[PDB]
Sequence to fold (230 residues):
Amino acid sequence: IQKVILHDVLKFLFVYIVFLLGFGVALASLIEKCPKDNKDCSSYGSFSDAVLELFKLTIGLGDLNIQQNSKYPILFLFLLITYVILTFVLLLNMLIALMGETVENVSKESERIWR
Amino acid sequence: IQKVILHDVLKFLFVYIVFLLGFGVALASLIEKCPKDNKDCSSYGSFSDAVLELFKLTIGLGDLNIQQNSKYPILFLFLLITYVILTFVLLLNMLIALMGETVENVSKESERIWR
Ligand SMILES: CCCCCCCC/C=C/CCCCCCCC(=O)O[C@@H](COC(=O)CCCCCCCCCCCCCCC)COP(=O)([O-])OCC[N+](C)(C)C
Ligand SMILES: CCCCCCCC/C=C/CCCCCCCC(=O)O[C@@H](COC(=O)CCCCCCCCCCCCCCC)COP(=O)([O-])OCC[N+](C)(C)C
Ligand SMILES: CCCCCCCC/C=C\CCCCCCCC(=O)O[C@@H](COC(=O)CCCCCCCCCCCCCCC)COP(=O)([O-])OCC[N+](C)(C)C
Ligand SMILES: CCCCCCCC/C=C\CCCCCCCC(=O)O[C@@H](COC(=O)CCCCCCCCCCCCCCC)COP(=O)([O-])OCC[N+](C)(C)C
Ligand code: NA
Ligand code: NA
Ligand code: NA
Fold:
């Protein structure tokens, strides 16, 4: 666990941040007027809400409907399906990067530094 | 990440499209009359709704109830449990196809093209 939370996951965050914060603005700005007659107009409102409602998406949690008040419902989705794919690709770089670590190291690495 | 978004995932989409668009019609047509007295009769209405409510299923998101207005609630499910399995099989072809790529390449591939 320790050699794994030092070497691979720390990378994955650092690139998972920049996309989340990156794509976060893109969908947090495409949203437009919140008519006060219809308050809590959209989940993606301020930037703080965009980061989380994307965060809930990654873990496999919540609900989604491509109707949120925006200027471009066609562009408002292309940046979202984007975030699904681009996120997903790294998660496959995750399991293989640890796969390329465990078959070489564990049986000799763990038992010895344990001693 | 780059060698992975060129070679394996591009395949997985191209077969994930044809099933999604394929099974999308099958459940988008089996649905029938939307009585205007009972509007938003079903999630699977037009084809555009079928693609997404299947899309939300794949990522692990949303809600499901096998009651949606259809002619055949027995056939309306067999095409759905179908889409769960057939999708799932490719995702196992994913992790193994990258597994059959990483154990051969990474330690020599990445460090060298990086130079
Ligand atoms: C590694 C990066 C750091 C890690 C952090 C880890 C923790 C994650 C961080 C989580 C923070 C979540 C939001 C905090 C709260 C809101 C305030 C805010 O920050 O935004 C404000 C201004 O800022 C913007 O609008 C942001 C625009 C710039 C994005 C910068 C990304 C840089 C990443 C580059 C990466 C380099 C990669 C280099 C590659 C070699 C706007 O916010 P607001 O709408 O006014 O606020 C809501 C109001 N409320 C709070 C009262 C409700
Ligand atoms: C690779 C394929 C392309 C990739 C695309 C990637 C992006 C994904 C694409 C997403 C598009 C999502 C829907 C768009 C919006 C609706 C319009 C539409 O297209 O359908 C319309 C007609 O068309 C049909 O009814 C479709 C029937 C033919 C299916 C063709 C699949 C071919 C895949 C073969 C693969 C070959 C494999 C070969 C193997 C070697 C009906 O729609 P509607 O109900 O009238 O519209 C709703 C109305 N509203 C919008 C106002 C609400
Ligand atoms: C694929 C599965 C695996 C991976 C999954 C991904 C894993 C995680 C990856 C990455 C983290 C992703 C960011 C999530 C943040 C969502 C919430 C947000 O942005 O806004 C919300 C909170 O906002 C804040 O609290 C602002 C940030 C405060 C600083 C602390 C950051 C915590 C990270 C610590 C890192 C520890 C590192 C130690 C371990 C090494 C809303 O803003 P607000 O409105 O101000 O607050 C609401 C309440 N209020 C209105 C009453 C005030
Ligand atoms: C297992 C986990 C990992 C894999 C997960 C799977 C990963 C993804 C796999 C595959 C993608 C799956 C398709 C999802 C589409 C759902 C929405 C839909 O069909 O209809 C909706 C939108 O419809 C549209 O927007 C129509 C399509 C527009 C073209 C852009 C396609 C974006 C793909 C870009 C590809 C980027 C490639 C770059 C990266 C290489 C509804 O139609 P509407 O009613 O017209 O719109 C509603 C709003 N309105 C009423 C206000 C207008
Ligand atoms: Na899940
Ligand atoms: Na879920
Ligand atoms: Na694995």
Residues 75-114 of chain A form the longest helix (40 residues).
